[PDB]
């Protein structure tokens, strides 16, 4: 199993037990999830996205203008990480990131916003939307903002 973690915050984001597809010419990953129902805890049944509940992702809120401010700083920070670790990626990342930001802002009303369990404001903001079938959730992550953890057995909850 591969655990995908936030390059900035080191929080767990998802694992390769889900269907993962690359979009935006390798800039983003779309991770397909399922709605699940669990008891929480007079107790109540809660329903949510398995990606969110399994990895303890935390919902947050943005105005469109606040997200614009956040995402320009985030893409600058990933640029710096690439200059340190993967210099060959910097130029195509800048190009793709600017266009993907345009896409996200144009489709802004169609996303919910999630961050890692420790809620670092400099970490990645994952985007939740639903497929046309109106039942399947999926989440968008920035591929260059992830690090991979190998885990053959007995995955540990850590950051």
Numbering used by the authors: 1 to 41, 63 to 180
Give sentences copied directly from the paper behind this entry.
Histamine-Releasing Factor (HRF), also referred to as Translationally Controlled Tumour Protein (TCTP), p21, p23 and fortilin, is ubiquitously expressed in eukaryotes, and involved in apoptosis, cell cycle progression, cell proliferation and cancer (Bommer and Thiele, 2004, Nagano-Ito and Ichikawa, 2012, Bommer, 2012). In addition to its diverse range of intracellular roles, HRF is also able to activate mast cells and basophils, with the release of histamine, implicating a role in allergic disease. HRF can form dimers, and a disulphide-linked dimer was shown to be crucial for the cytokine-like activity of rat HRF. mHRF, hHRF and rat HRF contain two cysteine residues, at positions 28 and 172, and Cys172 is suggested to be the site of the intermolecular disulphide bond. The current model for the activity of HRF in mast cell activation involves cross-linking of FcεRI-bound IgE by dimeric HRF, mediated by interactions between HRF and the Fab regions of IgE.
